[PDB]
Symmetry: C2
Subunit: 49 residues, 2 copies
């Protein structure tokens, strides 16, 4: 666990780690999608009198 | 010529004639196109100022 934390911190520092090396491939799992940010954007026109 | 004018008048009277009988096909010739009747059609909307 300590070693895993070690390269976890190393990766989060900004370095590249290939976790496929010790994490094995397994069956399919339906992961949730990306969580997007949202600011409402809209343009409305004007009308003649 | 007279007989040709005769069934030409008959055809223009409203009936249909298969003129392929006395007029066999020949080599290709580039013909003009249909002449349309043209009137100006357009929309010119307005807007506020």
């Amino acid at each position: 666990r300590r070693l895993l934390a070690s390269m976890g911190e190393l990766f989060v520092r900004g370095i590249d780690v290939d976790w496929t090396a010790m994490v094995p491939a397994a069956g399919w799992v339906d992961l949730p999608t990306y969580a997007f940010e949202h600011r409402h954007y809209w343009l409305e026109p004007a009308e003649p009198a």
